[PDB]
Amino acid sequence: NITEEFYQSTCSAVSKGYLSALRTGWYTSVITIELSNIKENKCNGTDAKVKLIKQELDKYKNAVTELQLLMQFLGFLLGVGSAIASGVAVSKVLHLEGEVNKIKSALLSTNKAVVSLSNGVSVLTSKVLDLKNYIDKQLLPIVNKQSCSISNIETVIEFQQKNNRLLEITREFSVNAGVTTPVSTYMLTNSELLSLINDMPITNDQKKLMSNNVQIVRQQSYSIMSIIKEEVLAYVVQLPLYGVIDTPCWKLHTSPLCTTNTKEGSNICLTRTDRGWYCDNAGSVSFFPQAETCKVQSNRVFCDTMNSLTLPSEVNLCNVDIFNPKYDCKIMTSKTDVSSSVITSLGAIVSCYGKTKCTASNKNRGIIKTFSNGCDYVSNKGVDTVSVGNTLYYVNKQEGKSLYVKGEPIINFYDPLVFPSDEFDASISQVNEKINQSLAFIRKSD
Amino acid sequence: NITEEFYQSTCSAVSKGYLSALRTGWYTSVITIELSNIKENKCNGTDAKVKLIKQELDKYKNAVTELQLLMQFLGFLLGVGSAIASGVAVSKVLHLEGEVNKIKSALLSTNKAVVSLSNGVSVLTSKVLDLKNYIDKQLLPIVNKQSCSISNIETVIEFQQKNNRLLEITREFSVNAGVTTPVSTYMLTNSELLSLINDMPITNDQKKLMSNNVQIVRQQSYSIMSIIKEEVLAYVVQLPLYGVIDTPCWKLHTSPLCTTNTKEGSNICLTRTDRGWYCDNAGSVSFFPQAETCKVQSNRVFCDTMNSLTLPSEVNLCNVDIFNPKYDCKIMTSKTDVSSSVITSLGAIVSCYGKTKCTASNKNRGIIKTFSNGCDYVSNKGVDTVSVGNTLYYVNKQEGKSLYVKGEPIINFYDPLVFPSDEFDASISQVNEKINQSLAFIRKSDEL
Amino acid sequence: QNITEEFYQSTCSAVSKGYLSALRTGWYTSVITIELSNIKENKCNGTDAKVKLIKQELDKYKNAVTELQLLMQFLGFLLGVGSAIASGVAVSKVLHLEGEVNKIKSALLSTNKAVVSLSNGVSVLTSKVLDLKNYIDKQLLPIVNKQSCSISNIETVIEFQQKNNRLLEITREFSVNAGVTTPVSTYMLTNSELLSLINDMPITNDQKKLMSNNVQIVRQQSYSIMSIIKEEVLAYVVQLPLYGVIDTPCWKLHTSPLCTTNTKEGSNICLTRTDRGWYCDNAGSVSFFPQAETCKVQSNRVFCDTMNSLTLPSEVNLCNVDIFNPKYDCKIMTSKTDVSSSVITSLGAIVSCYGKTKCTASNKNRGIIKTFSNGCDYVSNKGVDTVSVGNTLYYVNKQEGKSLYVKGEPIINFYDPLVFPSDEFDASISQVNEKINQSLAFIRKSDEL
Ligand SMILES: [Zn+2]
Ligand SMILES: [Zn+2]
Ligand SMILES: [Zn+2]
């Protein structure tokens, strides 16, 4: 499964076992709730049974009215999308004349139908709740039969269950301005969402993937309010569809790499800034700089190409030889020699500088390693916690073998006299350019 | 309505049709809920009916006890406010010297009153729910009368219905350390919120705006737990008051602009960094750099002046002539020749460099444009998606005319040999000055 | 009543000193178990409303069980990367092993609290907070099979949905969060359950009293991790904060940009301290929190997380009293961006007013009572209620406490605008002096030659 390599030379680590599930595009469905506009109830009197049904009908009638009022490091390199552009684009089409009537007619006999909208796009539609028929054909008839003092108390409770979902939906949208993420259990129950996946135009491998991770799918989905014309409430559900699946993926962890002299100043530091998730797709490598935004379950990675850059395969060369000519690896430089630790998939990188106390501890044995100054690594095999200064990090206990690639720290090849100490997004070649400009200009004057 | 102007020379676009709704200050109201403190019911029984009221009384009593325990790019330029300082200042006034009795007696005859507090501040107070009369004078008498075994299952259900709102209010406060935003429908029902707007000392133009956008109003509001002394639960509701309405607003979109030469390295880049929302305000320009925090409904923009800078009107010149001397436009420079796209209101900016495949497609026609190297623009008229590398962007489909301003790319005026390639918040004049300073060391020393 | 604040005109910053520490230093993990019966498919034919509710509820419960089974299967950049739930998950991984539940299940059959040693050697406390099995299997279903699914008394169905309700919310929270919840809700751990868990935690009475009086903050620093529902047990891990540093001095540093105040629109020079945030001394060094948002304040106590800190030498305070001191090189950033702004402190407001901006401080009764000139100034929250900087209206904190004005000449006046390096995001006073010295030498040495 998962493995890990720590490169001592550039103070970074690569975890390799993972598999992709990249969100590549969107699927939009139209969800409808058929609900009825009720005429004024003539049930006077405060008989205890009566007050409950009148109160419940009133909660429903207000909820409809409430709904009517409501309808009226390198992250900076990424670029700016519009998360709900697709679903909103579908939502606006539903406003056109007799589009609801088409949807309404399509779901008249079943609860699922494919409708060709006026713009030509065919979308799945679902009737997930039928309060129109329940109220008009079961509840109100029982009220007239029993003259509003219901003999059988269970029918009012049967209504209260049906009505709660419409009340929770109207409560959520009252607070979200009609666009929510993740999509709630009231908007789409778990069984409904699983059912939409079976009917989506994707391979069984994709259907099986989504069905086994509905909670991830749910979190990557949007719920867009659309209309309440006629007797219908309609909102668009925007689902992620994963167009790239099961390609190899790897995560890069990076930490500052500094010289190890104890004197307070005069230390110089260097950090790889390309930390994040890498997944090769379609002959290229997709890079996700904010690895927090990617969600991992088992050994499969769900990222979103909205948060990616599309890079040449040669990026991989930065891990093995940072100075290679084929790709200019991104680095940052400073004189701030602060101690910290980065917990990786299968261990921990410890950048220990200055006078910091740095230790690795076992749950049973106590402290079992004290670090020297510099960037080092420890496997999660014998180690349970790592303590850097006053910070105690627990280590990941995911199983897998890690291997330490010894090497001379890269920072030793720079002398502090010509080293450019404020560069936030420089490269291997860019630092050399500033060194040669600085090494010639100072030398030439003498 | 809305329009959009794309400037090819500086690789940016401006969306212009919008109208402002700026949060300018706060309005604080006190919401009170009347509660009865219940003593431990000495009600034993293994009847399913009795167990139901006992569970409900216990659920209510714990909520009271739960509430009792509760008593004890250019974003960095912005500056730091204290969001709920106004509401907290009101809440603190409620803890001292029995101020609740004043509210409690003021709300004795109606459910709405204006109270002048110890500090002199007059605040609206509202009694939104009277659970005391139900519990102490209808329910518990029935319990002691029928020896805790309620005959009618409806009496227990009415209780759990009456009891429900207090339980959710206490839930929200339990999970948010007594400060919630947005303000929920349990905190303030939709009908209650519309009524408070009518009672606020603001214009009908302000009242009409808030009333038609409660879902935004709720999102810009805070609900602050204050006290539960003397059979009263009180919390402060902090509502936004919109002091600037209907002034022109425009959003600036920017993307990196790089040279298009074939050499893989040695390419140069330049990006405008003042992206964000600008709303003309009181003779100046209020700038909101983090456009996520602003909310747009139809063609109306709700922003928060807490997240703004107040700038001279001359800011606008960065859109028309970036090199003018009167205002120093902010930029960043690099050699990081990466491809990306920025989706605008009415189209998409495509920054396509290197060997990346960049295309814009229509839902019916397929691919309809292949982009060349450089920063270009596309209207959302015929285009539905834009694809940059392995990233597929859907374009915004709002109607409006977008307009293309031809121009020579600004970055071509620099030679790559003296270009300062790592400037994170530089300006037009600051970059010119570092080249000018670097041009001096060469000319005077070399010809020497 | 020990909260105070000092404003340093010299470097346009302010320090709030009265506070007390409560740092999360590590984690305590317990396993919470709920006893469940797996309900097999009911054979209820009939459309009587009573049957309709019973069947509706039984299917509602079965969905939750099925749903839960699906679940088993400035200076922030310097901080470093933790794994927040690595500890809780490590416990959760062990519970997946064959028959680890039986160890748990037998330990809690006679009481509701027991310590179980797992396969990996870890002894962890386990708690049974709810027994839904006995109601369903020995009270509800027997009545169903006896009365041929036609329930006589509607009270038993309302009894059921109430018994069933908590498990339904627990499964909802997990279903929407991919099995990891924070803060830990009252459905995950009721208020009395948590207070009881605190008593059994391996901590001092100072720690128990601290956590017991701030459960709502404890909840905000806790995680709840779904693990298993095998063989009539639902188990999830609750990850609780244990506060290893308590009642040590803490102070908040507020900083603002400091610029020259000349009338010329351009050509101004600026300078800002970047070490704003919360500071707490603990083990003879100073734990620094640059992201003051992650720290929560209740009255005079600061709840922070050592995961979001840097550990710095005690010499950091030297930056507050004499920024040019030799023992620590204070971090600052430099710019030419002459923008007006305001930073509200604990006991007042810093007003950095530059250019032509209208800057004002007002009282609720008197109206406008002070207009600021160009430069860095300060105002106490005593007489002042609001502060207006340009078109932004700031309300000031009204916490009681004395603030004091440390008069001094702004540091920015000691630099000449001609040699000032104006693009530095994390340089130091000495690093900038060195850039002045390298540039002052090239100009001085060239004139001699
Ligand atoms: Zn940890
Ligand atoms: Zn030029
Ligand atoms: Zn129990």
Contact A88, A227 (CB under 8 A): no
State the Cα–Cα distance between residues B142 and B134, nearest whole angstrom.
11
- Give backbone dihedrals phi and psi of C88, rounded to 5 degrees, phi first: -60, -40
Contact A406, A8 (CB under 8 A): yes
CA-nearest of A87, A80, A81, A92 to A221 is: A87
- CA atoms lying within 13 Å on the CB side of residue A285: 17
- Chain B, window 326-345: residues with a beta carbon less than 8 angstroms from a chain C beta carbon: 326, 328, 330
**A-interface mutation test, from B357, B391, B419, most A Cβ less than 10 A away:** B391
Structure tokens at C4: 């105070």
Residue identified by tokens 């029918």 is A155
Residue identified by tokens 């299917």 is C59
Task: Tell me whether A299 touches chain B (CB under 8 Å).
Answer: no
Element (H, E) at C243: strand C233-255
CA-nearest of B385, B356, B390, C71 to A247 is: B390
- CA atoms lying within 13 Å on the CB side of residue A159: 26
State the Cα–Cα distance between residues A403 and A11, nearest whole angstrom.
14
R_g of chain B, CA atoms, integer Å: 30
Task: Tell me whether C121 touches chain A (CB under 8 Å).
Answer: yes
Contact: C90, A216; criterion CB under 8 Å: no
CA-nearest of B234, B231, B238 to B125 is: B234
> Under DSSP, is residue B241 helix (H, G, I), strand (E, B) or coil?
strand
Long-range contacts of A353-357, Cβ-Cβ distance < 8 Å, separation of 24 or more: A353/A256, A353/A258, A353/A260, A353/A267, A353/A269, A354/A262, A354/A264, A354/C313, A355/A262, A355/C313, A356/A388, A356/A389, A356/C311, A357/A387, A357/A388, A357/A389
State the Cα–Cα distance between residues A128 and A29, nearest whole angstrom.
12
State the Cα–Cα distance between residues B119 and C385, nearest whole angstrom.
12
State the Cα–Cα distance between residues C48 and C52, nearest whole angstrom.
6
Size of interface B-C (CB pairs under 8 A): 139
Structure tokens at B32: 């009170």
Task: Please list the residues that pair with C387 across neighbouring strands.
Answer: C361, C394
Q: Where would I find the H helices in C148-248?
A: 154-176, 191-199, 205-212, 215-220
One DSSP character per residue, C394-434 reads: EEPP----EEEEE----GGGGS-TTT----BSS-BHHHHHH
State the Cα–Cα distance between residues B324 and C57, nearest whole angstrom.
72
State the Cα–Cα distance between residues A339 and A355, nearest whole angstrom.
9
- Give backbone dihedrals phi and psi of B197, rounded to 5 degrees, phi first: -65, -40
Contact B212, B166 (CB under 8 A): no
Size of interface A-B (CB pairs under 8 A): 128
Query: Does B416 sit behind a cis peptide bond, omega within 30 degrees of 0 on the bond before it?
Result: no
> Under DSSP, is residue A218 helix (H, G, I), strand (E, B) or coil?
helix
Question: Burial of C291 by CB count in 10 Å (0-12 exposed, 13-18 middle, 19+ buried)?
Answer: middle
Cα C108 versus chain centre, distance: 34
Give residues with Cβ within 8 angstroms of C387, minimum separation 6: C342, C344, C349, C351, C360, C361, C362, C379, C393, C394, C395, C396
Ligand 1 center to C25 CA (angstroms): 9
**C-interface mutation test, from A391, A393, A395, A438, most C Cβ less than 10 A away:** A391
Element (H, E) at A376: strand A374-379
Handedness of CA B336, B337, B341, B342 (dihedral sign): positive
Task: Tell me whether B413 touches chain C (CB under 8 Å).
Answer: no
Element (H, E) at A159: helix A154-176
Task: Tell me whether B76 touches chain A (CB under 8 Å).
Answer: no
Task: Tell me whether C122 touches chain A (CB under 8 Å).
Answer: yes
State the Cα–Cα distance between residues B380 and B5, nearest whole angstrom.
13
Rounded to the nearest 10 degrees, the angle between the axes of helix C429-448 and helix A428-445 is 40
Contact: B190, A178; criterion CB under 8 Å: no
Structure tokens at C322: 């004499």
State the Cα–Cα distance between residues A62 and B191, nearest whole angstrom.
10
Structure tokens at B229: 């002394």
Q: Preceding residues of all breaks in chain C (C to N beyond 2.5 angstroms)?
A: 73
Structure tokens at A147: 């003259």
The reported resolution of this PDB entry, expressed in Å, is 3.4
C-alpha angle B271/B275/B278, rounded to 5°?
150
B159: which DSSP letter? H
Contact: B79, C341; criterion CB under 8 Å: yes
- Minimal Cβ distance to B396: which of A48, A82, A328: A82
Residue identified by tokens 């509003």 is A148
Structure tokens at C343: 């930073």
Pairing of strands A244-254, A257-258: unpaired
Give residues with Cβ within 8 angstroms of B146, minimum separation 6: none
CA-nearest of A30, A94, A27, A34 to A235 is: A30
Task: Tell me whether C272 touches chain B (CB under 8 Å).
Answer: no
- Give backbone dihedrals phi and psi of A391, rounded to 5 degrees, phi first: -105, 125
Contact: A392, C26; criterion CB under 8 Å: yes
Give residues with Cβ within 8 angstroms of B187, minimum separation 6: B31, B169, B172, B180, B223, B235, B237
Which residue is closest to C57 within chain A, CA to CA?
A: A161
Q: Which chains touch B (3 or more CB pairs under 8 A)?
A: A, C
- Give backbone dihedrals phi and psi of C270, rounded to 5 degrees, phi first: -130, 160
Contact: A390, C25; criterion CB under 8 Å: yes
Contact B207, B200 (CB under 8 A): yes
B57: left (phi over 0), alpha (psi -120 to 50) or beta: alpha
Ligand 3 center to C35 CA (angstroms): 9
> Under DSSP, is residue A80 helix (H, G, I), strand (E, B) or coil?
coil
Contact B6, B403 (CB under 8 A): yes
State the Cα–Cα distance between residues A341 and A352, nearest whole angstrom.
8
- Among all ligands shown, which has an atom nearest to the Cα of A386? 1
Structure tokens at C252: 């908040």
Contact C31, C95 (CB under 8 A): yes
Contact: A77, B338; criterion CB under 8 Å: yes
State the Cα–Cα distance between residues A25 and A239, nearest whole angstrom.
9
Task: Count CB neighbours of B157 within 10 A.
Answer: 19
One DSSP character per residue, B396-447 reads: P----EEEEE----GGGGS-TTT----BSS-BHHHHHHHHHHHHHHHHHHH-
CA-nearest of A439, A427, A438 to A324 is: A427
Task: Please list the residues that pair with B385 across neighbouring strands.
Answer: B361, B394
Task: Tell me whether C392 touches chain B (CB under 8 Å).
Answer: yes
The CA dihedral of B251, B252, B255, B258, to the nearest 10 degrees, is 160
- Per CB-CB distance under 8 Å, the chain B contacts of C337 are 77, 330, 425
Contact: C306, A363; criterion CB under 8 Å: no
Ligand 1 center to A394 CA (angstroms): 4
Contact: B79, C215; criterion CB under 8 Å: no
